[PDB]
């Protein structure tokens, strides 16, 4: 389509934003200064000429160019769009910005008020850190704290974006006109897309209630939880690099992986894992293994998902943590290598298979020839269905489910 605002993004170099207000020093492929918006010691304030951002490792703070300059002038992000706009002769009619942006820059804006907000309530705070989430990640990840709806409110007031935050269905409304934040009491975890804009949240409750431990956002033309992978966005190029991913559960199983900085690590949205997200994970990676807790309904969820990762032409490599051990427990008692370790030991499913079907014949025949039917390269499949055959003597008409 057409944007004033999107044209406008387009043409801005945020280092020549930034540098207009900061002594910005060139540190590799980035600049660094101290930070405006925290005190200190050391520059913690980073501006990524590739990336188009800014994020500040000290208080987590981070954004686009027109973002800095909201917060520097204390104006809203269109306010600052617009002074940008005069700055670089574009043009930007306020009436013309589309809700569909303002959803963006309020789901965006509400973040930096959980953040915030999780800074400043020493119950929350502390709560994080005694889960084993590491400072550094929690600032990485957003992590934020919803403390009152009216603080809320006041905020998307304030900034015009109500009514955009309105369609997220993230706000409650109990009686007309007044608000209930969805999140209210809970750390807030929020969720991004795979190029990092924040589409929703997670929230997990902190206090003794009725309602449940972990709510997400509503499925919305915003946020479709079956279609996106938390983490996805800050685990991408770990993923490339190291050429496989690590699937966990959920949002603290890989918190805690990536506090002890084992980052090429997603996890499904809320819940299982759906095909959309085993499709999305495919673009990344071709080799997943996964690591859901040590027992039997953990071994049971990973046994669902291996056939969505399969149909995905995903090579997976179910990692088996001890009874009783969930990815934070391992650790705690073994430490960060050894879980390392325990996943590099983990052998390719078909493989483990071919290995131990000498256990159960019987069962294991029945498991193979399942998992089998979800292979969709036939070469690959048939030199598999081979290699059984000649090992077990199960007859290919068997194993190939020929009925
Ligand atoms: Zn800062």
Redesign the pocket.
Do not use: E, L, R, T
């Given at each position: 389509m057409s944007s004033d605002i999107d044209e406008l993004r387009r043409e801005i170099d945020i280092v020549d934003v930034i540098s207009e207000y900061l002594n910005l020093e060139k540190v590799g492929s980035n600049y660094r200064t101290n930070?405006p918006?925290?005190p200190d010691d050391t520059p913690?304030?980073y501006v990524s000429p590739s990336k188009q951002i800014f994020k500040?490792f000290?208080?987590?703070?981070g954004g686009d160019a027109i973002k800095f300059v909201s917060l520097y002038e204390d104006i809203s992000y269109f306010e600052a769009a617009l002074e940008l706009a005069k700055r670089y002769g574009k043009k930007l009619d306020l009436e013309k910005i589309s809700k569909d942006e303002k959803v963006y820059v309020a789901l965006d804006r509400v973040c930096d008020f959980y953040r915030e907000s999780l800074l400043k309530n020493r119950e929350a705070s502390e709560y994080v850190k005694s889960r084993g989430i590491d400072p550094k990640v929690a600032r990485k990840f957003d992590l934020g704290y919803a403390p009152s709806s009216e603080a809320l409110v006041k905020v998307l007031k304030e900034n015009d974006l109500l009514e955009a935050y309105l369609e997220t269905k993230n706000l409650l409304s109990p009686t007309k006109g007044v608000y209930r934040d969805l999140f209210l009491r809970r750390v807030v975890i929020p969720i991004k897309d795979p190029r990092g804009r924040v589409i929703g949240f997670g929230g997990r409750r902190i206090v003794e209630d009725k309602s449940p431990k972990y709510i997400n956002s509503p499925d919305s033309r915003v946020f479709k939880k079956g279609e996106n992978l938390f983490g996805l966005y800050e685990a991408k190029e770990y993923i490339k690099e190291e050429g496989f991913a690590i699937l966990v559960e959920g949002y603290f199983d890989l918190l805690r992986l990536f506090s002890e900085g084992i980052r090429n690590v997603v996890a499904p949205l809320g819940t299982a894992l759906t095909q959309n997200q085993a499709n999305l994970l495919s673009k990344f990676t071709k080799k997943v293994y996964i690591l859901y807790d040590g027992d039997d309904a953990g071994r049971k969820a990973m046994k669902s998902a291996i056939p969505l990762l399969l149909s995905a032409g995903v090579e997976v490599y179910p990692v088996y943590l001890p009874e009783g051990y969930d990815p934070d427990e391992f650790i705690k008692e073994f430490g960060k290598e050894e879980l390392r370790r325990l996943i590099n030991s983990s052998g390719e499913l078909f493989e483990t298979l071919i290995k131990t079907a000498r256990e159960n014949l019987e069962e294991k025949t029945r498991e193979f020839r399942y998992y089998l039917g979800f292979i969709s390269d036939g070469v690959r499949r048939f030199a598999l269905a081979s290699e059984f055959h000649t090992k077990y003597k199960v007859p290919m008409e068997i194993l190939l489910m020929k009925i």
């Open positions: 930070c918006f925290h913690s304030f500040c000290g208080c987590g703070v």
